[PDB]
Amino acid sequence: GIGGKILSGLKTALKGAAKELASTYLH
């Protein structure tokens, strides 16, 4: 169950929030 705590920070920061923040520039 631990992955749904840790990756919900780490992957969300890496390519959720830093997809949207970077979205104009990279897409």
Q: What is the string of helix and strand elements?
A: HH
Strand content: under 5%
Number of strands: 0
Distance between the termini: 33 Å
Mass-distribution shape: rod-shaped
**What class do helices, strands and sheet pairing give?**
mainly alpha
How large is the count of helical segments? Answer: 2
Counting structural domains, the number is 1
Gyration radius from CA atoms, angstroms: 11 Å
Helix content: over 70%
Main beta-sheet annotation: none
PDB class: antimicrobial protein
Keywords: maximin 3 antimicrobial peptide alpha helix, antimicrobial protein
Assembly: monomeric
Entry title: solution NMR structure of maximin 3 in 50% trifluoroethanol
Structure description:
This protein has one domain (1-27). It is built from two helices and no strands. It has helices spanning 3-20, 23-26. With 27 residues, the chain is mostly helical. This is Maximin-3.
Secondary-structure blueprint:
Elements: H1 3-20, H2 23-26
In short:
The protein has 27 residues and is mainly α. Helices cover 81% and strands 0% of the residues. It is classed as antimicrobial protein.
